[PDB]
Amino acid sequence: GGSTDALPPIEQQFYETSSKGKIPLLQRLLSLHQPSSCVVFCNTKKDCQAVCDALNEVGQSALSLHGDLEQRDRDQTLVRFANGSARVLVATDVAARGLDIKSLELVVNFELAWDPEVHVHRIGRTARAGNSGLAISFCAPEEAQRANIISDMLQIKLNWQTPPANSSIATLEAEMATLCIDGGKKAKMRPGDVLGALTGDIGLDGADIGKIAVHPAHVYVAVRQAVAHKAWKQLQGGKIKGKTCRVRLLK
């Protein structure tokens, strides 16, 4: 029906599960969907840890993003997800606050947000298209009241999907890999120069090379797995723009 009617970019998905039942459920949704970039919401460090724990346990590339974390971890975590070096990034409302994301593949909500606005704001800001703008809140039907008003104010309906019996969780493998270089602006890192360092000093191609996050302290450069393990290996004994720096491939 509405499908042909230019379906809405912001989809509202709801799943009934427990604080623990969400662990196996979330991963499953990522194994069956295989999203290029999924941002899981967490209320506290606990949830963020529990999620990443289960994911890493099976072999799912995940990463945590907090607001009280160190700049390094923040940039290293933001680049790992933005560059596509990871699969699931568990961040908080304060951590993923208007961050650098405008093409999220899916936004998983560990639990109903604080307000009906933020909830839609998260997915609404992260994306605003059909392919994107996916929001999946994991929580028992007890909080249905929150989704009832949230869906009403949005003039839309929610697809309360129930969890399956068994579980065929899979392992999501990264497609890229960021490189935490210790060059930064100090090493004269410009939006394009770093490219020559990898596509000139290392021997990588533009197809493998990804995004590059430059900073006044350090610089990050993405690289396809095809040349990820190599980029870091080469740089180890090389240098960018004639400057000996330290690289670190974000797993």
Coordinates of all heavy atoms in Angstrom, one line a residue, residues 8 15 18 38 47 51 66 76 89 96 155 167 177-178 190 197 251:
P8 N 7.9 6.3 3.9 CA 8.6 7.2 4.8 C 10.1 6.8 5.1 O 10.4 5.6 5.2 CB 7.8 7.2 6.1 CG 7.1 5.8 6.1 CD 6.9 5.6 4.7
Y15 N 10.4 -4.2 19.0 CA 10.6 -5.6 19.3 C 10.5 -5.9 20.8 O 11.2 -5.2 21.6 CB 11.9 -6.2 18.8 CG 11.9 -6.3 17.3 CD1 12.0 -5.2 16.5 CD2 11.9 -7.5 16.7 CE1 12.1 -5.3 15.1 CE2 11.9 -7.6 15.3 CZ 12.0 -6.5 14.5 OH 12.1 -6.6 13.2
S18 N 13.7 -8.8 26.7 CA 14.2 -8.4 28.0 C 15.5 -7.7 27.9 O 16.2 -7.8 26.9 CB 14.2 -9.6 28.9 OG 13.0 -9.7 29.7
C38 N 25.6 0.1 11.9 CA 24.5 0.0 12.9 C 24.9 0.7 14.2 O 26.0 0.4 14.8 CB 24.1 -1.4 13.2 SG 22.6 -1.6 14.2
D47 N 25.1 -1.4 29.6 CA 24.5 -1.8 28.4 C 25.5 -1.8 27.2 O 25.6 -2.8 26.5 CB 23.3 -0.9 28.0 CG 22.4 -0.7 29.2 OD1 22.1 -1.7 30.0 OD2 22.0 0.5 29.5
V51 N 26.5 -5.3 25.3 CA 26.2 -5.5 23.9 C 27.5 -5.9 23.1 O 27.6 -6.9 22.5 CB 25.7 -4.2 23.2 CG1 25.4 -4.4 21.8 CG2 24.4 -3.8 24.0
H66 N 31.4 6.6 24.2 CA 30.8 7.4 25.3 C 31.2 8.9 25.2 O 32.0 9.3 24.3 CB 31.4 6.8 26.6 CG 30.3 6.6 27.7 ND1 30.4 5.7 28.7 CD2 29.1 7.2 27.8 CE1 29.3 5.8 29.5 NE2 28.5 6.7 28.9
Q76 N 38.9 7.7 17.5 CA 39.3 6.4 17.1 C 38.0 5.5 16.9 O 37.9 4.6 16.0 CB 40.2 5.7 18.0 CG 40.8 4.3 17.5 CD 41.8 3.7 18.4 OE1 41.6 2.7 19.0 NE2 42.9 4.4 18.6
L89 N 28.1 0.1 16.4 CA 28.7 1.1 17.3 C 27.7 1.4 18.4 O 26.8 2.1 18.2 CB 29.1 2.3 16.5 CG 29.3 3.6 17.4 CD1 30.5 4.4 16.9 CD2 28.0 4.5 17.2
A96 N 26.7 10.1 20.9 CA 26.3 10.3 19.5 C 25.4 11.5 19.3 O 24.5 11.5 18.5 CB 25.6 9.0 19.1
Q155 N 2.3 10.3 13.5 CA 1.3 10.1 12.5 C 1.6 8.8 11.8 O 1.3 8.6 10.6 CB 1.2 11.2 11.5 CG 0.0 12.2 11.8 CD 0.0 12.6 13.3 OE1 -1.1 12.7 13.9 NE2 1.2 12.9 13.8
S167 N 17.9 -19.4 17.4 CA 18.8 -18.3 17.1 C 19.9 -18.8 16.2 O 20.6 -19.7 16.5 CB 19.3 -17.7 18.3 OG 19.1 -18.6 19.4
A177 N 39.1 -0.5 7.4 CA 39.9 -0.4 8.6 C 40.6 1.0 8.7 O 41.5 1.3 7.9 CB 41.0 -1.5 8.7
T178 N 40.3 1.7 9.8 CA 40.9 3.0 10.0 C 42.3 2.9 10.5 O 42.7 1.9 11.1 CB 40.1 3.9 11.0 OG1 38.7 3.9 10.6 CG2 40.6 5.3 11.0
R190 N 46.7 17.2 5.4 CA 45.7 17.9 4.7 C 44.7 17.0 4.1 O 44.9 15.8 3.9 CB 46.3 18.8 3.6 CG 46.8 20.2 4.1 CD 47.6 20.9 3.0 NE 47.4 22.3 3.1 CZ 46.4 23.0 2.5 NH1 45.5 22.4 1.8 NH2 46.4 24.3 2.6
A197 N 50.3 9.5 0.5 CA 51.1 8.7 1.4 C 50.9 7.2 1.3 O 51.8 6.4 1.3 CB 51.0 9.2 2.8
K251 N 40.9 -2.3 14.7 CA 40.3 -3.6 14.5 C 38.8 -3.5 14.6 O 38.1 -4.5 14.8 CB 40.8 -4.6 15.5 CG 41.9 -5.5 15.0 CD 42.7 -6.2 16.2 CE 41.9 -7.4 16.6 NZ 42.4 -8.6 16.0

